[PDB]
Design a binder for this molecule. Structure first.
Ligand SMILES: *Cc1cc2c(nc3c(=O)[nH]c(=O)nc-3n2C[C@H](O)[C@H](O)[C@H](O)COP(=O)(O)OP(=O)(O)OC[C@H]2O[C@@H](n3cnc4c(N)ncnc43)[C@H](O)[C@@H]2O)c(*)c1C
Ligand code: NA
Ligand code: NA
Length: 490
């Protein structure tokens, strides 16, 4: 009652939604990307606030502190467990939803931009393009992902070998802390500014906007997508790829998608067919690439082409707030430091990817720039020595069809354990997986011991510094969820 009362004093009421409000279901559902989490059995927010100004965010936080109602912040809503808009167990929370704060201001000459957290990646990329055809930013591949969560958790895509992760190309932020105070880099200090750029969403406050450096790309890039069935020698080719791809020049990224006994090699090359063809011949002739495979286009055109296979619909693919694709979905991830034996590739392609409920596996090679940053330089620790990341993706489309996919996801994670990283078994924070572990709350504070179980998997040796920073900026654990950094205080 009095939390809502506090909000109405400071924030335009058209931006406030209670469960009884007629628009509440629409506002709640607008950026839910996973049908597992939209159904009525999920725990719902007591209130939703859709700020349009930074002062609205500050007022919401001050009200939540005064009346002890916690806030989950949502930008693009892609959280794999939905923790930006649901809780796992019954509890009271408000959602602060940033979708209306979506400005992108590009300074093409300075090669910098200010980007609101509620902007989607496609909108960031398109705004950069409206300014220059030869500037880029290295974040995710999916245009509807929100800037807020993508940058907070790291963020990587087809430029990761050239330029590393999104978070290490951030040069300032505008942030509201757990006391409602407005911060930038200078007022936050080294620890807090280090933590917020890759240490995971929610934990370190609400980032309102990010200042980024914009990076050069040539006017023409080249994409290919070359598939090999097991009959065409997929196992021998991918067994070579895992050693070669992490060692290729920074200008060339070759990722793999597999969903059966067949591997599709997708390359982004910062250059032309003319130079790519000989490079492939010299370094990876086993793939059988030739000039007919090349698709030359601008960097901006490469974003819908890689993600959707589209060449012809730039605005529609990058400026898209319809929220049409809502699979039921499960996700896991791994990091690989040692080459798989050929027999493991045999098993993955011929056996694991031909089971009931089998999903899709995506393999991103590291090396080059992402691996040159020291492990502790940012909170993202998956750097030197990483050959490739694996994402295990399961989609299904009817409510009662979950059992086989969920079982496959668990079974293949168990199968892969001996061949992937261990002690800890590393995972990417933005591929959130609650089965890696969740927090325990004691005296209303997330415990350090419970955070450490999953926290070492996402952040390896950076977890303790994250928790000590959390203790300094949010000792009462105001901004939290079931898998957020717990405070470690003296
Ligand atoms: C759905 C989806 C996700 C993808 C896709 N492809 C990716 C890619 O190519 N590269 C990646 O690095 N990641 C990819 N992912 C995963 C996404 O990066 C993550 O799912 C992001 O965390 C999603 O961010 P966003 O869309 O903003 O999701 P939310 O659910 O709103 O938030 C996630 C998380 O972060 C907190 N949070 C949100 N907003 C803020 C701000 N402004 N400040 C601090 N913290 C924030 C939330 O509370 C929540 O905890 C491809 C697809 C299709
Ligand atoms: Na290890
Ligand atoms: Na999950």
């Amino acid at each position: 009652e009095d939390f809502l009362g506090c909000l109405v004093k400071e924030i335009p009421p058209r931006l406030l939604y209670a469960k009884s409000s007629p628009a509440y279901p629409s506002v709640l559902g607008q950026t839910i990307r996973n049908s597992r989490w939209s159904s009525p059995d999920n725990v719902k927010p007591l209130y939703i606030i859709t700020p349009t100004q930074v002062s609205h965010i500050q007022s919401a936080v001050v009200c939540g502190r005064r009346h002890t109602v916690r806030i989950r912040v949502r930008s693009g809503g892609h959280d794999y467990e939905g923790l930006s808009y649901r809780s796992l167990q019954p509890e009271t929370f408000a959602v602060v939803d940033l979708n209306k704060m979506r400005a992108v201001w590009v300074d093409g000459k300075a090669r910098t931009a200010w980007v609101d957290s509620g902007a989607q990646l496609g909108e960031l990329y398109y705004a950069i393009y409206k300014a220059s055809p030869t500037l880029a930013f290295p974040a995710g591949v999916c245009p509807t992902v929100g800037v807020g969560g993508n940058f907070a958790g790291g963020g990587f895509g087809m430029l990761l070998r050239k330029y590393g992760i999104a978070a290490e190309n951030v040069i300032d932020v505008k942030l509201v802390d757990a006391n409602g105070k407005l911060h930038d880099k200078k007022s936050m200090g080294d620890d807090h500014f280090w933590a917020v750029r890759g240490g995971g969403g929610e934990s370190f406050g609400i980032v309102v906007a990010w200042q980024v450096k914009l990076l050069p790309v040539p006017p023409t890039v080249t994409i290919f997508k070359i598939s090999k069935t097991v009959s065409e020698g997929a196992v021998d080719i991918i067994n070579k790829w895992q050693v070669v791809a992490p060692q290729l020049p920074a200008d060339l990224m070759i990722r793999i998608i597999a969903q059966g006994p067949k591997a599709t090699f997708e390359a982004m090359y910062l250059g032309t067919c003319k130079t790519l063809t000989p490079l492939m011949s010299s370094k990876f002739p086993e793939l059988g690439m030739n000039p007919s495979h090349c698709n030359e286009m601008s960097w901006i055109q490469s974003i819908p082409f890689v993600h959707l296979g589209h060449r012809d619909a730039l605005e529609d693919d990058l400026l898209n707030r319809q929220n049409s694709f809502k699979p039921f979905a499960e996700y896991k991830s791994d990091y690989v430091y040692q080459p798989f034996p050929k027999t493991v590739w045999e098993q993955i392609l011929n056996t694991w990817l031909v089971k009931p409920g089998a999903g899709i596996m995506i393999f991103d090679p590291y090396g080059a720039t992402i691996s040159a940053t020291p492990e502790s330089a940012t909170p993202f620790p998956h750097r030197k020595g990483v050959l490739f990341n694996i994402q295990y993706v399961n989609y299904w489309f009817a409510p009662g069809a979950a059992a086989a996919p969920l079982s496959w996801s668990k079974d293949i994670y168990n199968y892969m354990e001996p061949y992937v990283s261990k002690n800890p078994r590393q995972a990417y924070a933005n591929y959130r997986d609650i089965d890696l572990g969740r927090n325990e709350v004691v005296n209303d504070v997330s415990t350090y011991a419970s955070g450490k179980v999953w926290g070492q998997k996402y952040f390896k040796g950076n977890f303790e510094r994250l928790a000590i920073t959390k203790g300094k900026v949010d000792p009462t654990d105001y901004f939290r969820n079931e898998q957020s950094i717990p405070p470690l205080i003296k």
